[PDB]
């Protein structure tokens, strides 16, 4: 499935913070589930797999120091929800940061 | 001379837009002198040498598509005047952009 770059959430039932927060249950993984819900993610129930209610993008293997919003932007730049909560400034900063990181190592 | 990263302009007499704009005279160079004055620069009177009234930083060899604020940030990141007119968001964007550029080529 391709990313929903529409202004309409792909998964309306997970549009409310609360709704998302509930899908987690006892969260044992490194990243805070509150942060995840705010960043728009709800849990799938297998490993640390989360999915954005709006663009539908998914992430896993959440490392210690890895940020929800940061990753959200990194992998689902077209997500409108992301755009609504952070604005393009933030988003570009993150994309420049990531690309520069990949370059520094290269 | 080192860059003035103080909140007090190094050259108070050039603190007013008008004051700066006047130092140019007939400007023949590529970059717009209005843009330059806004970015805080006043002309020295030799080639396209300009200097920030606040941090005192200087630039020359103004190329066709080269921006005052962009360059100001590139070479005088510590300038408080710069910080006051653009905010850190903008400034980081520019620094990430420049560094990533230097990396892409490398
Ligand atoms: C933040 C973390 N380090 C991180 N995760 C990811 C990440 O999952 N990505 C990057 C874009 C693609 C995705 C990924 O590989 N998923 C795999 C496996 C998978 C199948 N169903 C789901 C549902 C939810 C998450 C993953 C997943 C795929 O084939 O779709 C990048 O950084
Ligand atoms: C925007 C343009 N491409 C550009 N200019 C510059 C630029 O001048 N720099 C970068 C930081 C240092 C400065 C520079 O080299 N000046 C020379 C020559 C010089 C002597 N007196 C003055 C007064 C005003 C400007 C230059 C200058 C130096 O030794 O101080 C970078 O990009
Ligand atoms: Zn999303
Ligand atoms: Zn300055």
| Domains of chain A, residue spans | 1-106
CATH architecture of A1-106: Orthogonal Bundle (1.10)
For residue A7, which phi and psi values (nearest 5 degrees)?
-85, 0
Quote the ligand 1 centre to A62 CA distance (angstroms).
Answer: 10
Cβ atoms of B5 and B77 within 8 Å: the answer is no
Strand order in the sheet with B50-52: B41-43, B50-52, B58-59
CA distance to B12, B14, B18, B90, per residue, from B94 (Å):
27, 25, 27, 6
B55 is in an annotated binding site: yes
Check CB contact under 8 Å for A93 and B89: yes
DSSP strands (E only) in A44-105: 50-52, 58-59
Q: How many CB atoms lie within 10 A of CB B56?
A: 17
3 state DSSP class of A35: helix
Q: Hey, which residues does B52 pair with through a beta bridge?
A: B41
> Is B33 touching ligand 2 by the criterion CB < 6 Å?
no
Quote the ligand 4 centre to B29 CA distance (angstroms).
Answer: 21
Distance CA B22, CA B4 (A): 23
- Whose tokens are 């200087």? That residue is B58
Distance CA A15, CA A29 (A): 23
* Residue in A89, A97, A104 nearest the CB of B103: A104
- Whose tokens are 């640390």? That residue is A48
Query: How was this one solved?
Result: X-ray
* CB-based burial label for A37 (10 Å; 0-12, 13-18, 19+): buried
Structural resolution in Å: 2.8
């Amino acid at each position: 499935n391709f990313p929903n770059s529409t202004n309409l959430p792909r998964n309306p039932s997970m549009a409310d913070y609360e709704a998302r927060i509930f899908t987690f249950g006892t969260w044992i993984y490194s990243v805070n589930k509150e942060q995840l819900a705010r960043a728009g993610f709800y849990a799938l129930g297998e490993g640390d797999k989360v999915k954005c209610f709006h663009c539908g993008g998914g992430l896993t293997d959440w490392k210690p120091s890895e940020d929800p919003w940061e990753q959200h932007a990194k992998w689902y730049p077209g997500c409108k929800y992301l755009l609504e909560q952070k604005g393009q400034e933030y988003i570009n900063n993150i994309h420049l940061t990531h690309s520069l990181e990949e370059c520094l190592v290269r």
